Amino acid sequence: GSFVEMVDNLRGKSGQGYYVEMTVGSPPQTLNILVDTGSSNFAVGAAPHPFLHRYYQRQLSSTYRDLRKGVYVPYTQGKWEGELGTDLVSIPHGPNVTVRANIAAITESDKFFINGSNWEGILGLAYAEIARPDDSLEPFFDSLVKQTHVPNLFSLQLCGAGGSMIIGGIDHSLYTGSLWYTPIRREWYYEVIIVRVEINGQDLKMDCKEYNYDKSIVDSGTTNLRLPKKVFEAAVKSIKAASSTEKFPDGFWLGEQLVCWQAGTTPWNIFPVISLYLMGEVTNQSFRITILPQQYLRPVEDVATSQDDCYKFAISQSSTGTVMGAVIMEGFYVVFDRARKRIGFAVSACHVHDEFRTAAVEGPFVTLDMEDCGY
């Protein structure tokens, strides 16, 4: 099971995340699992629920071992309660291996499972520092590297309208041009540093620590580009100014309401490009990733609205720092090089573009009067 067989192993409908097929237990029970770089638990629905098509049945697995420890994970609004154990885990369209890993068997949940997402669990790919109940609960990826010869690296190619998760290597057929690396600041979330933000090449002209208040992360489990209050307001002001030929409700800018245009007439040209400059591997060198409106204006698939093309503004205000979500990752080949504590970005085969503009990864960029951009 090489990278060739790993290509196109991801699915997922707009705004509901990307999932990979996995097996838990012996005989293997097949489930769809959300690929999440923003969390560190492997947590699977293990009891019936209105939104679950299937769930993990521990009584049917002869390899299951109960850890006699509970886990309670509350979020902003949603939450899940579970029971810890271990069992045999495999990724049928990933590395040709089966490992023993920690599993949080979800017995109760509230606003966690999404109606029609098609996933029954979450694969948290981030570090042990943020694992629940504590850092002593070894994440799946750490177990995989420990128990197999798989190199300490994975890559994500998320595509808009599926994609690929490549474990253990870089698949050179999934990207064009250069791979540019940003250092992983701290191993907890995939924490990175944004050194500059431009909107249609116009610098937001803020102290770069503002872009990373209190952290900046690469999160496949978050849909939007989430921005700290001060940065979000200036980005919205710039986007509204550039798109002034059309006026949208306040609701649109709050990411709550749809903006629709008759099929094939979306005025892409009126919306600006967002450039996120990421800290390079060498002092005061950086590179940028360019985000087109085809990424930040997320299409909302609905048969009832299908005579038009409708979208949600996929940029939102955050109080927990910058979040480079799925809309940001889409179109790029993102390398999570845990072995070298770095994240690589390159233009992917499924990048967004039109006749005038294209998603890009460019560098190097030099700054001479640069402070440290982190908090």
Ligand SMILES: C[C@]1(c2cccc(-c3cccnc3)c2)NC(N)=C(c2ccccc2)N1
């Ligand atoms: C656990 C979950 C999560 C749990 C359940 C569903 C999702 C989800 C929802 C919509 C699309 N994709 C994934 C995410 N995964 C991630 N990354 C977050 C998170 C959100 C904001 C900041 C930091 C972390 N929440």
